[PDB]
Amino acid sequence: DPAKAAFNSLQASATEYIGYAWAMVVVIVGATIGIKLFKKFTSKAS
Amino acid sequence: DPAKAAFNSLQASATEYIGYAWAMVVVIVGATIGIKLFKKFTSKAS
Amino acid sequence: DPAKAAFNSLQASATEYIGYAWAMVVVIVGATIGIKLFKKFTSKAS
Amino acid sequence: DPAKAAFNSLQASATEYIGYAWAMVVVIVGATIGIKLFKKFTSKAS
Amino acid sequence: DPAKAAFNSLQASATEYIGYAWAMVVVIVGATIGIKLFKKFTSKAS
Amino acid sequence: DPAKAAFNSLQASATEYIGYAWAMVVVIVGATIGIKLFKKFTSKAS
Amino acid sequence: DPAKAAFNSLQASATEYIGYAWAMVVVIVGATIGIKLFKKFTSKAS
Amino acid sequence: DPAKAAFNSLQASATEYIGYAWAMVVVIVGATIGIKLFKKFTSKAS
Amino acid sequence: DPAKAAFNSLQASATEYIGYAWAMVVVIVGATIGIKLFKKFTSKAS
Amino acid sequence: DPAKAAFNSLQASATEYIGYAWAMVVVIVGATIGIKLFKKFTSKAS
Amino acid sequence: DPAKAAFNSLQASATEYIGYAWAMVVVIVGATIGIKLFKKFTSKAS
Amino acid sequence: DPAKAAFNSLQASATEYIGYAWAMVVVIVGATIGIKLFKKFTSKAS
Amino acid sequence: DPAKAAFNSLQASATEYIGYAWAMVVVIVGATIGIKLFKKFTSKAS
Amino acid sequence: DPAKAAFNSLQASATEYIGYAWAMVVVIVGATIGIKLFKKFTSKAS
Amino acid sequence: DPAKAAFNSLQASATEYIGYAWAMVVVIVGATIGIKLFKKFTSKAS
Amino acid sequence: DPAKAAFNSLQASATEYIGYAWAMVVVIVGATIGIKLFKKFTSKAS
Amino acid sequence: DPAKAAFNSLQASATEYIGYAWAMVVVIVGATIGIKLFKKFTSKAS
Amino acid sequence: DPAKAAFNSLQASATEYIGYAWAMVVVIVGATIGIKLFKKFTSKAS
Amino acid sequence: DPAKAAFNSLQASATEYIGYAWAMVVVIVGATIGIKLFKKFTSKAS
Amino acid sequence: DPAKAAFNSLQASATEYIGYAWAMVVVIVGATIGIKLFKKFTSKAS
Amino acid sequence: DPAKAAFNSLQASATEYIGYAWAMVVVIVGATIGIKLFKKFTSKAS
Amino acid sequence: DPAKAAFNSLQASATEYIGYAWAMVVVIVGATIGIKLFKKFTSKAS
Amino acid sequence: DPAKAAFNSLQASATEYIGYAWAMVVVIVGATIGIKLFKKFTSKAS
Amino acid sequence: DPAKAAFNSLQASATEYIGYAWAMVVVIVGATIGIKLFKKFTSKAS
Amino acid sequence: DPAKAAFNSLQASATEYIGYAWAMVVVIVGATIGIKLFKKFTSKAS
Amino acid sequence: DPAKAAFNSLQASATEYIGYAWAMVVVIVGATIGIKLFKKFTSKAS
Amino acid sequence: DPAKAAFNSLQASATEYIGYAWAMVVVIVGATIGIKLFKKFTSKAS
Amino acid sequence: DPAKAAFNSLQASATEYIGYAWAMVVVIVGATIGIKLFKKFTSKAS
Amino acid sequence: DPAKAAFNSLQASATEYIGYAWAMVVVIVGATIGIKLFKKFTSKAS
Amino acid sequence: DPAKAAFNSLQASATEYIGYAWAMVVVIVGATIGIKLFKKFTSKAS
Amino acid sequence: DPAKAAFNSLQASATEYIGYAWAMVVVIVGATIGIKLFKKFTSKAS
Amino acid sequence: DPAKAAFNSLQASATEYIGYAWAMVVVIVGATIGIKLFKKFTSKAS
Amino acid sequence: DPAKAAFNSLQASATEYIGYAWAMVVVIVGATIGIKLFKKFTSKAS
Amino acid sequence: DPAKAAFNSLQASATEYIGYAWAMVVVIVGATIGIKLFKKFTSKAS
Amino acid sequence: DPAKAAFNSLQASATEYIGYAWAMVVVIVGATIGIKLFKKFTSKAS
Amino acid sequence: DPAKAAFNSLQASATEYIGYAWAMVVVIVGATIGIKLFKKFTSKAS
Amino acid sequence: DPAKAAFNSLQASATEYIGYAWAMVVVIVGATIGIKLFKKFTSKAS
Amino acid sequence: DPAKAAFNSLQASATEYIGYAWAMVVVIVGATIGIKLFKKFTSKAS
Amino acid sequence: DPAKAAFNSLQASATEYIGYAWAMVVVIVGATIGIKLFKKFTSKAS
Amino acid sequence: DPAKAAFNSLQASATEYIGYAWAMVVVIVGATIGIKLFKKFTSKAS
């Protein structure tokens, strides 16, 4: 079925995009949470 | 009647399309909800 | 009248086709509405 | 006149055919409108 | 007048032939118009 | 004049035959025109 | 006069022949007109 | 004139046939227009 | 009358041909209407 | 009367020929009307 | 007129669809508002 | 003119059908607008 | 000239027949065109 | 001369017969042309 | 000329039919546009 | 020459009859062409 | 030539009928076009 | 022209619809803005 | 050419109808845009 | 040859009648085609 | 010889009659063919 | 006007919904502002 | 009758053509509906 | 009767010609109707 | 009598010639009717 | 040839009608496109 | 042989008349075919 | 029989022409259907 | 018998001419039917 | 042969008329296609 | 046989006329069908 | 015998005249049939 | 009613989705409020 | 056969016209699809 | 049947075109869905 | 240009709405900033 | 070509509409951005 | 072939119109996309 | 088939459009994500 | 390719808008971050 192959390729492409999205969000959140913890720990320790 | 068999085949084809659509939407929504919960919980815990 | 039996056979065929249509539209609309509710509720619950 | 009786019997046959046509159109229009309203009201409710 | 009798007999023959002709006309024209109206009403009803 | 009486008899006989002929012509044409008009108007009305 | 009596005999004999001729003319003309009208009315009827 | 009376009779017969034709066309056209407007207005309302 | 029997035979033959014509038109019109309604209802269901 | 017997023989002969002619006319017209009606009804049915 | 009864039946069918739609929308909106108020009040109280 | 009464009857039928249409559309539009306002106001009030 | 009188009388007969023919033509053509315009205008107005 | 007088008598008698012949011709030709034009104009009128 | 009067009376009948058609089209177009504007303005206001 | 005078009279008589015939032909054709053109132009205009 | 005058008269009559035909077609076509443009522009404006 | 009056009436009908729509939208927007300002000012003041 | 005046009258009627259309669309579009701006600005200002 | 002159004169008559016929043909066909093109172009332009 | 001279006289007289006959034939045939072609070309022209 | 009554009923229904919306928002805001003031006053007083 | 066999063989050929038509329409309708459902379900899932 | 034999032989010739005619009719009409149905079914299936 | 014997011889000889004439008539009439029916049936068949 | 001039004059009339049609279509298309673009650009700007 | 010379003269005269007849036939047919083709091609081109 | 061979030859010629007609109609119908499906499928794909 | 031999020769001559006539008839009809069928099938195929 | 030259002349005349017909149809079809494509492309661009 | 030669010469004339007729038929029918296909293909391509 | 020799001379002279008659018949019949077929085939060709 | 069963199944499916949504939101809110209370109580107690 | 060559040359001309039609439809369809895809992809990218 | 091969070739052409359509729609839909997912995921990840 | 005036009035109406929006936002912001400053200054001063 | 000038005029009209739209959107967006920045900066500064 | 030049001129006209369409759509789409980007970027930047 | 090449060319054109769309969307989304991240990181760091 | 140039100009216009957007966002963010740092540093230093 052409439709079966089409739907399978669309789902495979979606999975690749999800992989890239997760890589980017990890990098962004790492920085936001890192900066938050640094500012919090520096002031608290002082 | 040829129409009876034709209508039945089209309904079976629609059922196949619904199966493909549900599989893709589960993957798509799963990633969306996962990223949302990840950012939310990370902010609350840190 | 040969027409009386002809018109009757055509109206019986129409009634059969309306039943095949009301079985396909239930399946298709049910799936689309189900996907809509699934995405909506997952977003609100998360 | 023979033509008088002929014209009257033809106008009688035409009236019978009109009745058959009206009965069939009611069923078909009812089905098409029913499916249209079903889809509209379902989408609005969801 | 043998001629008067001849003309009178010729008219009865003509009148009979006219009756036979009218009967066949009604049957044939009724059928053709019946098929015409049948096709027209079926198309509009569908 | 015997010859005059003869001419007068044959002319009177001709007039009789002309009257009989005219009556038959009216009957034949009326039937034909009736059939023609019936077919035409039945086709037009439908 | 014997000659006058002979004339009367000739006239009476001729009258008999005129009657026989009229009977022959009626049947022959009837067939000719009958077949003519049959073909005419059958054509118009069909 | 024999023709004068014959022509008048044929014109009167034509007028009668016109009356029958008008009655039939009114019934048929009325039904076809009614079905058309019914389908149109049902669609607009829905 | 020879013409009487001939006219009756032709009218009977016409009735037989009308029966064959009605059978064929029912089959053809039924198929065309069926294909039309099939395409219409499949579109509405989808 | 020898002349009477002669007229009687020729009239009887004419009647025989008229009967033969009528039979042939029925066969020829029946065929033509059959072909005409077959073509007309075949065109109408389709 | 058949149209009058047909229009009345279609309006009655529309009323039934409206009843089904309102029941579903009350359940759907009830859940949506309930979840929203639940999260809001829990956050304010705690 | 038979047409004057025919056109008048058609315009009277049209006026009746427009009234049946303006009764169905009021019910349908009223319901859809009511559902829209219901969802909108419940969201803002909550 | 008995011939001049014959030709003059023949023309008056022809002129009368032409008047009768024209009267019948106006009635028949008026009706056919009236039905044609009626059907056309009803369809466009609807 | 008695012979010359006899010639004059023959000429006068012939003139009378020519007049009777002309009257007969006028009525017969009038009927023939009248029926011809009647059939022609009735056909064109219808 | 008889045709002159005939053409003029036909052009008069056509003008009357145009008036009837215009009156009907105004009512039908008014209703369709009225329903269209009602739905549009109601949706915009809500 | 008496024979010459005779030929001259018959030729003059023929010319008279030819003139009368031409006048009648113009009247008959004019009527027929008028009816034909009236029907054609009335059909075309509508 | 009698034919020359007759042909010229028939051509003049044809020209008159063309003038009547053009007047009628202008009125009818104008009305049909006007109704068409009216419906089109009302829809575009709404 | 009937179209001129029809277009003017439709424009007047549109003006009425606009008046109804503006009245409803003022009430609808008034409530929306009122609730928004109520919640905002209450939070700021308290 | 009668057509030159006919085509000119049709183009003049078109120009008039375009003006009636450009007066209705200005009113309708103006109202819809006014309602859109009203709702948008009230929301931002509040 | 009085015959040669007769044939030569007959041709000139025929040639004149052909010229008259062609002139009338051009006028009638020009009008019918003009109306045909007028109706076609008006419909496409509108 | 007187007999030979008489023969010559008969031949010369016959030649004169042949000439008169030819003149008569030309005018009569001219009218017959002229009316025939007039009717033929008028029919084709219309 | 059916449209007038429809628009008036829609506005009346909207006013009822606005009444319910205001009742609900007063209850919600009472609680949110009450809890806020309680927490604020309790801590400040302590 | 030869026509009986002819009508039967034509109704047999028509049935064969109906089978070919139904087979083709099933393939084409299946493809169009398949593409329609594919696009709809894909868009909804994404 | 040599005439009876002649009439009998003429009928067999006629009957043979009718058989030949019917055979050719079936072939030609079958082909024309086959092409007609082929074009109709191909268009509807596509 | 020798004269009586001669009469008998003449009658017998005439009978022979009547037979030869009948054979000639049969073949000639057969060809005439055969070609007539051939042309008639070939035309109807095509 | 008269036909040559006739064909040329008809091709000249057709060219004139094409010019009138093009002028009218430009005005109508300009108006419809103008209204379409007006509504589109206004909505986008607001 | 005087008789031979006579036959030779009449045959030569016949050939002359045949040549004149052929010339006239060409002129008449050419005109008729020209008119027929002009009408046909003018109808087809438009 | 000469007619037997002639009828058979004409039927064979008809069969040959049917073969040529079928070949041409297949090519033309195939192209028109192909263009139709090409435009339809390109639109669906886009 | 010399008279018998004469009748036999004329009958043989008639048969020869009948054979020649039949051959010419076949050639003429074949051509006409071929042209008719070519035109019909060429029109149908396209 | 006189007919040979006549047939050749008529075929040449037909070719000339075909040239005039092709010129006119190219101009008319070109204009109608141009107007169609103009309206289509303006709509697509807008 | 001078008759055999006459029949043989008549056939060659007929065969030539058939060749000339067929040539003209091909040219005329080719042109009409060419214009028909041209108009059809231009419309579908556009 | 001188009488027998005279008989032989008469027979030989008659044979010469029969030959001259046959030559005359051939040319006259050829022209009649030639013009008939020319008109027939030109009509079918066009 | 197929619509009744369809609407009932859709509402039942919605109720199931609402059950899952409530389960998920309880789990999420439990964690967010638990973490909030823990952090608040730990710091306050210290 | 001349018809064989004619049918073949017509099928050759039809094939040429199909080629021209296909070339034109490719260009027009390419342009319409190109504009459609351009607008779609541009809107999606922006 | 030539139709059996014709219908088969048309269904084979349809199957080929459906494959070309299912290759273009996969590419187009794939691209549009890919762009949708790209924009959606980039927004959520950032 | 009607469009120019329409666009100018829409822009003027927009400018008025902007004036009202700015008046309302100044009042709202005055209060929010006033309350903020009051609360801030009161506590800071204390 | 008239189309060239028409297309150029429509493109010029589109350019005018774009100029009006850009002017209005600058005013509309200017107010929107101005109010947003006003509220934002006032809150930050105070 | 006159068609070859006709089809070529039509394809050249199509190519010209496609260029005028691709110049208008670029301007219109460019403006709409420009307005979209303008509003989007101003909002994000502010 | 020309369709095969046409479909392939259209798919290649679609691929080109997809390439242009992806390039533009990367630039557009890149700027959008860049501005969002710029504002977010600047606020977090400062 | 017109599409290539169009897509390239759209991308170039987008790049210019991105340049302006970045300039504006730098100015806005400079102020918001500047005010934030000033307020923070002033209070902290004090």
Author numbering:
A (entry chain G), B (entry chain F), C (entry chain P), D (entry chain S), E (entry chain N), F (entry chain Q), ...: 5 to 50
Direct quotes from the study:
Filamentous bacteriophages package their circular, single stranded DNA genome with the major coat protein pVIII and the minor coat proteins pIII, pVII, pVI, and pIX. Here, we report the cryo-EM structure of a ~500 Å long bacteriophage M13 mini variant. The distal ends of the mini phage are sealed by two cap-like complexes composed of the minor coat proteins. We further performed local refinements of the mini phage by dividing the particle into the top, middle and bottom three segments.
The middle part of the M13 miniphage consists of 20 protein layers (from layer 4 to layer 23) of pVIII assembling to form a cylindrical capsid with an outer diameter of ~60 Å and an inner diameter of ~24 Å. Similar to the pVIII assembly in the wild-type phage, the pVIII molecules in the layers overlap with their neighboring subunits, resembling fish scales, and form right-handed spirals in the symmetric cylindrical shell. The helical parameters of the pVIII array determined by the real space search with Relion22, are 36.60° for the twist and 16.36 Å for the helical rise, which are similar to the values of 36.40° for the twist and 16.60 Å for the rise determined by solid-state NMR15. Further helical averaging of the reconstruction improved the overall resolution of the EM map to 2.7 Å. Each pVIII interacts with eight neighboring pVIII proteins in six different layers primarily through hydrophobic interactions, hydrogen bonds and salt bridges. The twist and rise of the helical array are ~36° and ~16 Å, respectively, which are similar to the reported parameters for the helical array of the major coat protein pVIII in previous studies. The inner surface of the capsid is decorated with the positively charged residues K40, K43, K44, and K48, which are clustered in one region of pVIII. The distribution of the positively charge region in the capsid follows the symmetry of the capsid, which, however, is not consistent with that of either the A- or B-form dsDNA. However, the number of contacts varies when a symmetric capsid structure built with the helical averaged map was used. Furthermore, the plot calculated with the symmetric capsid shows no distinct peaks, indicating that the capsid with a uniform and symmetric conformation is unlikely able to establish a unique interaction with the ssDNA and trap the ssDNA at a specific position.
